[PDB]
Write a protein that holds these residues in place. Structure first.
Motif, PDB file in Angstrom:
ATOM      1  N   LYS A  59       0.585 -56.488  45.245  1.00  0.00           N
ATOM      2  CA  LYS A  59       0.988 -57.770  44.679  1.00  0.00           C
ATOM      3  C   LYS A  59       1.941 -58.419  45.660  1.00  0.00           C
ATOM      4  O   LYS A  59       2.608 -59.411  45.375  1.00  0.00           O
ATOM      5  CB  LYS A  59       1.713 -57.552  43.359  1.00  0.00           C
ATOM      6  CG  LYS A  59       0.835 -57.700  42.126  1.00  0.00           C
ATOM      7  CD  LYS A  59       0.003 -56.453  41.863  1.00  0.00           C
ATOM      8  CE  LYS A  59      -0.689 -56.532  40.509  1.00  0.00           C
ATOM      9  NZ  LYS A  59      -1.418 -55.283  40.171  1.00  0.00           N
ATOM     10  N   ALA A 104      -8.275 -62.127  47.772  1.00  0.00           N
ATOM     11  CA  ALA A 104      -7.969 -62.102  46.335  1.00  0.00           C
ATOM     12  C   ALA A 104      -7.378 -60.747  45.921  1.00  0.00           C
ATOM     13  O   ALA A 104      -7.291 -59.826  46.738  1.00  0.00           O
ATOM     14  CB  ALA A 104      -9.236 -62.381  45.538  1.00  0.00           C
ATOM     15  N   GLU A 108      -9.041 -58.904  40.597  1.00  0.00           N
ATOM     16  CA  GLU A 108     -10.014 -59.986  40.597  1.00  0.00           C
ATOM     17  C   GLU A 108     -11.306 -59.560  41.308  1.00  0.00           C
ATOM     18  O   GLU A 108     -12.263 -60.325  41.368  1.00  0.00           O
ATOM     19  CB  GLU A 108      -9.417 -61.227  41.273  1.00  0.00           C
ATOM     20  CG  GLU A 108      -8.084 -61.656  40.679  1.00  0.00           C
ATOM     21  CD  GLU A 108      -7.367 -62.693  41.525  1.00  0.00           C
ATOM     22  OE1 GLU A 108      -7.204 -62.459  42.742  1.00  0.00           O
ATOM     23  OE2 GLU A 108      -6.962 -63.735  40.976  1.00  0.00           O
ATOM     24  N   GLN A 139     -10.664 -67.278  38.350  1.00  0.00           N
ATOM     25  CA  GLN A 139     -10.589 -66.161  39.277  1.00  0.00           C
ATOM     26  C   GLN A 139      -9.419 -65.235  38.944  1.00  0.00           C
ATOM     27  O   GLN A 139      -9.482 -64.044  39.227  1.00  0.00           O
ATOM     28  CB  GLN A 139     -10.467 -66.677  40.713  1.00  0.00           C
ATOM     29  CG  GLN A 139     -11.039 -65.720  41.742  1.00  0.00           C
ATOM     30  CD  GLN A 139     -12.539 -65.552  41.594  1.00  0.00           C
ATOM     31  OE1 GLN A 139     -13.329 -66.263  42.219  1.00  0.00           O
ATOM     32  NE2 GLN A 139     -12.945 -64.621  40.745  1.00  0.00           N
ATOM     33  N   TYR A 140      -8.392 -65.770  38.278  1.00  0.00           N
ATOM     34  CA  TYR A 140      -7.206 -64.982  37.951  1.00  0.00           C
ATOM     35  C   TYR A 140      -7.353 -64.262  36.619  1.00  0.00           C
ATOM     36  O   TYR A 140      -6.508 -63.446  36.253  1.00  0.00           O
ATOM     37  CB  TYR A 140      -5.954 -65.862  37.894  1.00  0.00           C
ATOM     38  CG  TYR A 140      -6.140 -67.254  38.439  1.00  0.00           C
ATOM     39  CD1 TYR A 140      -6.073 -67.512  39.804  1.00  0.00           C
ATOM     40  CD2 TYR A 140      -6.385 -68.312  37.580  1.00  0.00           C
ATOM     41  CE1 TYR A 140      -6.248 -68.791  40.290  1.00  0.00           C
ATOM     42  CE2 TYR A 140      -6.562 -69.592  38.059  1.00  0.00           C
ATOM     43  CZ  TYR A 140      -6.493 -69.826  39.412  1.00  0.00           C
ATOM     44  OH  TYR A 140      -6.674 -71.100  39.887  1.00  0.00           O
TER      45      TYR A 140
END
Length: 174
Positions: A59, A104, A108, A139-140
């Motif tokens: 992240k 991404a 995802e 997409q999230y």
């Protein structure tokens, strides 16, 4: 522009020569997080441009691969595409092409791969399809009345059953 063989040859080497500059340091990336999109996933014969999907499991690294990311001493131009997309202009055999890469999150992964493997047309057809049920697919994740909902899958065939749809192929469209 480029044939299936060309785009395969370059990407094969390019996915082993790829890297990113973090904190000034150099960090290579593994092909494990690099998927060739376009003629490779659409099973075409001659594309117009080559797309590429890179997933990041942190992240952090997800956004730290964004500042500096490229090949080792090559001919390329780093430009921004859209809002979150990125496009690079690379040169091979005294020619210049357009490379569109997409980074991404690992969460995802199923969402992205599916999205880039199928036809956009079908995707919207599905977007509205979900709205009709009061759902927004992004997409999230999945937005339910402005409430973001995470996914519990990680497989291409798991996502389709999780969504309640059948696996489709670009070859036939929709």
């Amino acid at each position: 522009m480029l044939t299936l063989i060309q785009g395969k040859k370059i990407v094969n080497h390019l996915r082993s020569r790829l890297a990113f500059e973090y904190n000034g340091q150099l960090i290579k990336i593994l092909s494990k997080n690099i998927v060739a999109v376009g003629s490779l996933r659409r099973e075409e014969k001659m594309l117009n441009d080559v797309d590429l999907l890179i997933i990041v499991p942190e992240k952090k690294l997800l956004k730290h691969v964004l500042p500096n990311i490229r090949i080792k001493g090559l001919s390329f131009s780093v430009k921004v595409c859209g809002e979150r997309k990125c496009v690079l202009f690379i040169e091979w055999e005294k020619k210049t092409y357009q490379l569109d890469l997409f980074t991404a999150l690992a969460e995802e992964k199923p969402y992205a791969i599916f999205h880039f493997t199928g036809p956009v047309s079908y995707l919207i057809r599905i977007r509205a399809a979900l709205k009709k049920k009061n759902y927004k697919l992004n997409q999230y994740g999945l937005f339910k009345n402005q409430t973001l909902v995470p996914l519990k899958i990680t497989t291409e065939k798991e996502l389709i059953k999780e969504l309640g749809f059948t696996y489709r192929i670009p070859k036939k469209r929709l």
